[PDB]
Amino acid sequence: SQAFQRQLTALIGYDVTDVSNVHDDELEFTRRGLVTPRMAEVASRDPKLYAMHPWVTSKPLPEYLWKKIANNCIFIVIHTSQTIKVSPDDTPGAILQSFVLRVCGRDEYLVGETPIKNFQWVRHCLKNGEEIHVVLDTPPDPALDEVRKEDCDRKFRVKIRGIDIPVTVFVEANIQHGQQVLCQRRTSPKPFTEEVLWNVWLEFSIKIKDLPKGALLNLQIYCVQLLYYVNLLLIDHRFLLRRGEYVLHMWQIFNADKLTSATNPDKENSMSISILLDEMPNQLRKQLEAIIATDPLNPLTAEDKELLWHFRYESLKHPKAYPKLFSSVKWGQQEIVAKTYQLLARREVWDQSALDVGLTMQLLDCNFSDENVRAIAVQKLESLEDDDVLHYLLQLVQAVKFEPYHDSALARFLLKRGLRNKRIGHFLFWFLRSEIAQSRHYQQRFAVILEAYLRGCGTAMLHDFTQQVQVIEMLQKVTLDIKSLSDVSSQVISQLKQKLENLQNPESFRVPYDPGLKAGALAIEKCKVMASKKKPLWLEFKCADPTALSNETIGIIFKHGDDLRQDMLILQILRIMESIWETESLDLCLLPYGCISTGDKIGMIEIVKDATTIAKIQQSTGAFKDEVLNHWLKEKSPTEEKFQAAVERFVYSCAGYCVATFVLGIGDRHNDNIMITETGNLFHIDFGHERVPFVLTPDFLFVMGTSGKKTSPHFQKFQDICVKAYLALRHHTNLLIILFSMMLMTGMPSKEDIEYIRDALTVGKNEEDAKKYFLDQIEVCRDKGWTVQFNWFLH
Ligand SMILES: CSc1nccc(-c2ccc3nc(NC(C)=O)sc3c2)n1
């Protein structure tokens, strides 16, 4: 029967049928709309390849990795087991006749027409110098992917009737098109009582014909302080102007939440509003080019826009110009939007333009409501490969918040690519689910998209998702209860022990942050409760796969009290930073541990094996000491090779974070939050948690062979890597600025904050300046030594 809709609801965390919180039928129309994209991708997909999900690339194997193929040969261990020699560009389809190739312990298969070098797992191994273990296996049944069978010249105007609260005031109405205010009207102020009626007409100056699709009536209540906001889409999803009586429950108090077409579902408590609807000169060329060259966050003066619009067609031959050219369109004029479209009809240079993800992203941000503009960005995304889509997904998802309508190219794109690849499909799930679970502002839209995906991923995936949700809700329950019962107490660990007995009577589940890894039974004697302020559960599980090479059990932390959505975003940008460096033969040894937000200030975390905190390494002797980090680093490594590798790994990873963590503006971190692996790899944790640009303390320096006033061949390497790392990122200024900007608009608590990255990336500066800029930032750190780290102790 429809019991299927109940399980969907439970998977999704929201009931998409529930037609309570709607004043029109856009969500339903979208549920209906997304059926054919769902069905088309399901039909188009190859059952074999879809069943095995080969993680693959096209990108040229980086040089530093070819240095670990100094023989033109690669060792593979097939499983009693035997080693085999294989050429870099041999097919797994070929080396089978060398007498289905599945990775040991993992749900990862090596299949299809591509060199073995083009498989991510192979590239993962070479990076680490670990022998490729592959079980000789027969492919899983594609049958388990079974999908269940299913001309107006009048001026626009609005009647503000009044507002109502259950438990000095004026309404403001704005006709908005993507952050542009096309027109603005106010009501007369009135004493602020529970019910305040105006029954006024507000007549705008923008004529009805001049309303563009995607235009919001944004209603705001002021006391002067903004108190409550609400939005209604003036032109609706069927292409019809808004009409009729409307009662909208408003949100209580810049971020993506202010743009939503959703209404406050809390009717018991919320404020509501009743409304009623019934060829050029050298120099101008030089000025134009200087406009197009400016970073994405550099404001256009009115002189700029009139210029850009005038040389419209000449501006079109530059893709870098597109965000700027479409930010100069007067969307509140019918004749102009028309011209804009004759122009978009001949966007031929952009179609042939090599795909610029950074450029692409801009046309999807808060500043473009036109869906035809937004579509040309989505058009470029069509050519991205899976590996690429996986780098951008979290932020492509977040960009759905900026779409004016629930059904768009973007939402359809994420749907297609999720339906076409289990791994993308896996992450898409948890991303959407995380947003559905915690944003009242966007759950309705995100829930609809997630239904649309779950009704097409097939029964296997469906049952996969079932186990994970069951498990994470089971464990979440436990996570909160313990925080209620609290440094670490005595009963607490026994109380925990006893709770973990109750919830093992689902027996296997995919780790949400690494879908390749099966988590079997818990290891109940290994589970603890950490001594940090928020009392998170240290939990580990035995791997479900018997075909695993070892018994290194999977560790996952469960935490409530911090915004892991923020962690998630930072980490994604970290993976994008590695991705730039990789294309410039740079491995900065970033360790961006796996992490998913599952609810409100609550989620999960990848435990990185063989690592501790630098604060813990200091604790081991408030009176800090210089030597103990190098001392600790030695007493872990047996051989001199390993220690020399470890110290190098430190020099790269430290440079890596110093660059990353500086550019993102999260440099000034406490001791507790930086961690190092015994293998030398350093990494930061907790992003939901007299200044300094980045942590580079005298114990860090001591390891490089430096204290106070000194330098070493290993330290001069550090600066060499930094600078090179620093101007690598700078080559992708436009990309970074967008990602940063979108991360704030969709993930954090202002115009000011958005521009740290402009100062951090030093826009307008030449190359040799930036060299010196970062080198002097290194210098600043040497001075403060332990004063700032001591601050965080006092704090
Ligand atoms: C507690 S709060 C927190 N918040 C964000 C992130 C984290 C985190 C991440 C990774 C991580 N790896 C660890 N490895 C070992 C061996 O202990 S511990 C740890 C902790 N913790």
JSON list of C-alpha atoms in Angstrom, two decimals, residues 26-42 44 213 237 239 364 371 374-375 377-379 381-382 389 393 396-397 399-401 403 405-421 424-425 428 432 445-446 448-453:
[
{"chain": "A", "resi": 26, "resn": "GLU", "atom": "CA", "xyz": [4.52, 24.51, -5.58]},
{"chain": "A", "resi": 27, "resn": "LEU", "atom": "CA", "xyz": [5.97, 21.62, -3.54]},
{"chain": "A", "resi": 28, "resn": "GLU", "atom": "CA", "xyz": [3.35, 19.22, -4.94]},
{"chain": "A", "resi": 29, "resn": "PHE", "atom": "CA", "xyz": [3.86, 20.54, -8.49]},
{"chain": "A", "resi": 30, "resn": "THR", "atom": "CA", "xyz": [7.59, 19.92, -7.96]},
{"chain": "A", "resi": 31, "resn": "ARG", "atom": "CA", "xyz": [7.04, 16.40, -6.62]},
{"chain": "A", "resi": 32, "resn": "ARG", "atom": "CA", "xyz": [5.07, 15.94, -9.80]},
{"chain": "A", "resi": 33, "resn": "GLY", "atom": "CA", "xyz": [7.66, 17.79, -11.90]},
{"chain": "A", "resi": 34, "resn": "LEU", "atom": "CA", "xyz": [10.63, 15.65, -10.80]},
{"chain": "A", "resi": 35, "resn": "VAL", "atom": "CA", "xyz": [9.06, 12.34, -11.87]},
{"chain": "A", "resi": 36, "resn": "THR", "atom": "CA", "xyz": [10.47, 12.46, -15.45]},
{"chain": "A", "resi": 37, "resn": "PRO", "atom": "CA", "xyz": [14.04, 13.42, -14.47]},
{"chain": "A", "resi": 38, "resn": "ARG", "atom": "CA", "xyz": [13.86, 10.56, -11.94]},
{"chain": "A", "resi": 39, "resn": "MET", "atom": "CA", "xyz": [12.49, 8.11, -14.51]},
{"chain": "A", "resi": 40, "resn": "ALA", "atom": "CA", "xyz": [14.83, 9.27, -17.31]},
{"chain": "A", "resi": 41, "resn": "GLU", "atom": "CA", "xyz": [18.01, 8.75, -15.29]},
{"chain": "A", "resi": 42, "resn": "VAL", "atom": "CA", "xyz": [16.76, 5.41, -13.96]},
{"chain": "A", "resi": 44, "resn": "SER", "atom": "CA", "xyz": [19.45, 5.64, -18.87]},
{"chain": "A", "resi": 213, "resn": "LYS", "atom": "CA", "xyz": [9.89, 35.79, -13.01]},
{"chain": "A", "resi": 237, "resn": "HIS", "atom": "CA", "xyz": [5.47, 28.18, -10.81]},
{"chain": "A", "resi": 239, "resn": "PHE", "atom": "CA", "xyz": [3.86, 31.34, -14.78]},
{"chain": "A", "resi": 364, "resn": "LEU", "atom": "CA", "xyz": [24.23, 30.14, -8.89]},
{"chain": "A", "resi": 371, "resn": "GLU", "atom": "CA", "xyz": [16.52, 31.05, -14.10]},
{"chain": "A", "resi": 374, "resn": "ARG", "atom": "CA", "xyz": [21.25, 30.16, -13.58]},
{"chain": "A", "resi": 375, "resn": "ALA", "atom": "CA", "xyz": [20.62, 27.51, -16.24]},
{"chain": "A", "resi": 377, "resn": "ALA", "atom": "CA", "xyz": [25.79, 27.73, -14.99]},
{"chain": "A", "resi": 378, "resn": "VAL", "atom": "CA", "xyz": [24.01, 24.40, -14.61]},
{"chain": "A", "resi": 379, "resn": "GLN", "atom": "CA", "xyz": [24.76, 23.83, -18.31]},
{"chain": "A", "resi": 381, "resn": "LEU", "atom": "CA", "xyz": [28.09, 21.65, -14.61]},
{"chain": "A", "resi": 382, "resn": "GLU", "atom": "CA", "xyz": [26.72, 19.03, -17.04]},
{"chain": "A", "resi": 389, "resn": "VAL", "atom": "CA", "xyz": [30.82, 16.62, -8.76]},
{"chain": "A", "resi": 393, "resn": "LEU", "atom": "CA", "xyz": [28.37, 18.60, -4.13]},
{"chain": "A", "resi": 396, "resn": "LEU", "atom": "CA", "xyz": [26.05, 22.71, -5.11]},
{"chain": "A", "resi": 397, "resn": "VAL", "atom": "CA", "xyz": [23.44, 21.38, -2.66]},
{"chain": "A", "resi": 399, "resn": "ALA", "atom": "CA", "xyz": [23.19, 26.58, -3.64]},
{"chain": "A", "resi": 400, "resn": "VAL", "atom": "CA", "xyz": [19.64, 25.15, -3.89]},
{"chain": "A", "resi": 401, "resn": "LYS", "atom": "CA", "xyz": [18.87, 27.64, -1.13]},
{"chain": "A", "resi": 403, "resn": "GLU", "atom": "CA", "xyz": [17.02, 29.08, -6.32]},
{"chain": "A", "resi": 405, "resn": "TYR", "atom": "CA", "xyz": [11.61, 28.14, -7.30]},
{"chain": "A", "resi": 406, "resn": "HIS", "atom": "CA", "xyz": [11.53, 24.58, -5.88]},
{"chain": "A", "resi": 407, "resn": "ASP", "atom": "CA", "xyz": [11.95, 23.01, -9.30]},
{"chain": "A", "resi": 408, "resn": "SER", "atom": "CA", "xyz": [15.08, 24.16, -11.13]},
{"chain": "A", "resi": 409, "resn": "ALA", "atom": "CA", "xyz": [17.95, 23.00, -13.33]},
{"chain": "A", "resi": 410, "resn": "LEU", "atom": "CA", "xyz": [20.15, 22.76, -10.23]},
{"chain": "A", "resi": 411, "resn": "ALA", "atom": "CA", "xyz": [17.75, 20.59, -8.24]},
{"chain": "A", "resi": 412, "resn": "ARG", "atom": "CA", "xyz": [17.28, 18.45, -11.35]},
{"chain": "A", "resi": 413, "resn": "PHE", "atom": "CA", "xyz": [21.08, 18.31, -11.84]},
{"chain": "A", "resi": 414, "resn": "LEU", "atom": "CA", "xyz": [21.77, 17.10, -8.32]},
{"chain": "A", "resi": 415, "resn": "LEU", "atom": "CA", "xyz": [18.94, 14.60, -8.84]},
{"chain": "A", "resi": 416, "resn": "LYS", "atom": "CA", "xyz": [20.41, 13.30, -12.12]},
{"chain": "A", "resi": 417, "resn": "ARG", "atom": "CA", "xyz": [23.97, 12.91, -10.82]},
{"chain": "A", "resi": 418, "resn": "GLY", "atom": "CA", "xyz": [22.82, 11.30, -7.57]},
{"chain": "A", "resi": 419, "resn": "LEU", "atom": "CA", "xyz": [20.65, 8.84, -9.51]},
{"chain": "A", "resi": 420, "resn": "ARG", "atom": "CA", "xyz": [23.56, 8.10, -11.86]},
{"chain": "A", "resi": 421, "resn": "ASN", "atom": "CA", "xyz": [26.18, 7.24, -9.23]},
{"chain": "A", "resi": 424, "resn": "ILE", "atom": "CA", "xyz": [27.29, 10.85, -5.20]},
{"chain": "A", "resi": 425, "resn": "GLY", "atom": "CA", "xyz": [23.82, 9.48, -4.48]},
{"chain": "A", "resi": 428, "resn": "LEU", "atom": "CA", "xyz": [23.51, 13.77, -1.73]},
{"chain": "A", "resi": 432, "resn": "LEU", "atom": "CA", "xyz": [19.82, 16.91, 1.94]},
{"chain": "A", "resi": 445, "resn": "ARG", "atom": "CA", "xyz": [12.21, 22.09, -0.60]},
{"chain": "A", "resi": 446, "resn": "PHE", "atom": "CA", "xyz": [15.03, 19.76, 0.42]},
{"chain": "A", "resi": 448, "resn": "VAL", "atom": "CA", "xyz": [10.90, 17.09, -1.90]},
{"chain": "A", "resi": 449, "resn": "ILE", "atom": "CA", "xyz": [14.25, 16.70, -3.68]},
{"chain": "A", "resi": 450, "resn": "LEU", "atom": "CA", "xyz": [15.25, 13.85, -1.39]},
{"chain": "A", "resi": 451, "resn": "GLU", "atom": "CA", "xyz": [11.98, 11.95, -2.06]},
{"chain": "A", "resi": 452, "resn": "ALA", "atom": "CA", "xyz": [12.64, 12.41, -5.77]},
{"chain": "A", "resi": 453, "resn": "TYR", "atom": "CA", "xyz": [16.06, 10.78, -5.27]}
]
